[PDB]
Design a protein around this ligand. Sequence first.
Ligand SMILES: [Mg+2]
Ligand SMILES: [Mg+2]
Ligand SMILES: [Mg+2]
Ligand SMILES: [Mg+2]
Ligand SMILES: [Mg+2]
Ligand SMILES: [Mg+2]
Ligand SMILES: [Mg+2]
Ligand SMILES: [Mg+2]
Ligand SMILES: [Mg+2]
Ligand SMILES: [Mg+2]
Ligand SMILES: [Mg+2]
Lengths: 107, 62, 50, 50, 31, 63
Amino acid sequence: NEVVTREYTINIHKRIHGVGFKKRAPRALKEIRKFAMKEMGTPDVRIDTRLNKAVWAKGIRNVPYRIRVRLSRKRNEDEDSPNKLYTLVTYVPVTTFKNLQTVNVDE
Amino acid sequence: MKVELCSFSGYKIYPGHGRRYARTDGKVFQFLNAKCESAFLSKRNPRQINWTVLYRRKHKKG
Amino acid sequence: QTKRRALEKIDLKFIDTTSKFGHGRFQTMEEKKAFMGPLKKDRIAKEEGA
Amino acid sequence: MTHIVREVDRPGSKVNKKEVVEAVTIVETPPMVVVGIVGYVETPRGLRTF
Amino acid sequence: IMNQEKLAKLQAQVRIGGKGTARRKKKVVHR
Amino acid sequence: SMLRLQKRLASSVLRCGKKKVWLDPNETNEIANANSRQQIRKLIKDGLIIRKPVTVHSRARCR
RNA sequence: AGAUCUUGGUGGUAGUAGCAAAUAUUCAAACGAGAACUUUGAAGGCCGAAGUGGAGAAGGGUUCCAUGUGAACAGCAGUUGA
RNA sequence: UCUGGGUCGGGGUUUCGUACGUAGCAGAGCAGCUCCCUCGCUGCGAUCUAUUGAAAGUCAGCCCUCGACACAAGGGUUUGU
Ligand SMILES: [Mg+2]
Ligand SMILES: [Mg+2]
Ligand SMILES: [Mg+2]
Ligand SMILES: [Mg+2]
Ligand SMILES: [Mg+2]
Ligand SMILES: [Mg+2]
Ligand SMILES: [Mg+2]
Ligand SMILES: [Mg+2]
Ligand SMILES: [Mg+2]
Ligand SMILES: [Mg+2]
Ligand SMILES: [Mg+2]
């Protein structure tokens, strides 16, 4: 379908490894944007503020290794824009990351 | 396949690994990796370090 | 080839197969498992399979 | 690459009939597949492909 | 009076920040 | 759309610096409608402006 | 045609040198045609009271404030601006 | 394509060295309670032991999966004796 929502866990440690201290969290934002870009194919990607806060919870350089996010493709037929579908990425708190798949959550 | 040695930790030093060390008194010691050397030279008791064989035998573990 | 460095019969005694991804100290998995015995992950795995 | 324990048969050496640990390398060599034959004819200008 | 619909939305607007921030006390409009 | 004068007036009114002045983000055009300290006081009565509490500097550790 | 001539204009260099002193920014929303730079909120930081805080002297003289503009300036940009 | 390659997960390897919580007549001692106990019980207490070669990391330029997910026969520009 085209309004699907899914649940992901992101190896931020994998995508951050090598970048300098004071770029770790902003590059983490860029890499989660590109993750959603390549997942949903939606040029418009919006990051929830609670997710940004969850990224920066340990300062600029002690970025968490693993983040459990949730992507949601919604209709952009609310105004005249070149892109008709966008992806909200919402932070999903978890107590552990062991044995977590990518699971298709309902609406 | 040569003569087998046991480290500061009592491990299994296969040939072509680690280092040996000599002292003025004549004692000869062999070590598996630089962690064992650094532990030994700091005068750290092997029986107190958690992961060595001597600790395991002192605590009956396994 | 005419030197004694060539024309050498090679008869190997031991072939090292420890981990090159760090300081390996075990040749093979069987020797490692015998050396260090059951672990926590093996304990819970044998719990799942009873 | 890895290292090998082996025996020495070098007369006149300090290491005659003594063990050595020597660095070696592993190069994987899966079998070839012959798929062509090409011929070269000798020329004054070199060696051209016939 | 409050029902489920009113409280369910009121929870969102009363929280104006992260954990450890003051909750909103009132939002009243007058003419 | 632009709220620097209103923020300055609110900081002068509430006797707290611009750090402790909170303007409601969703409701903006009524704040922009404010141009005088009297309307600012009407809004501070209406709750659209909130003085933020002080950042805690706990002395339990020192005690 | 010369005078390291006088005045003025224009080339290559060259879209080159460069726009690197003082830790650092990120998300959402608004306005607007346009947003890295404006505003608001959230977050993370810094000055750390011998401050990047609050007021004066000399000096400046309207730079103070309100509203509007996106000509020029603010060596990028600007919906902002001494 | 006898699919493919990714993204998570799993297993391996390895690094460090035994996590939080819980229990303990372990613990230098100290402060309270004795119809009570006849030597007890309630706290404070660094550190120690069991849970625990545990916990955590582990490719981004480490190895193997056949587990889950969706993605992939799509775009653009040129080229002729
Ligand atoms: Mg190595
Ligand atoms: Mg002349
Ligand atoms: Mg001249
Ligand atoms: Mg340049
Ligand atoms: Mg520069
Ligand atoms: Mg700070
Ligand atoms: Mg500081
Ligand atoms: Mg001052
Ligand atoms: Mg400019
Ligand atoms: Mg001014
Ligand atoms: Mg893995």
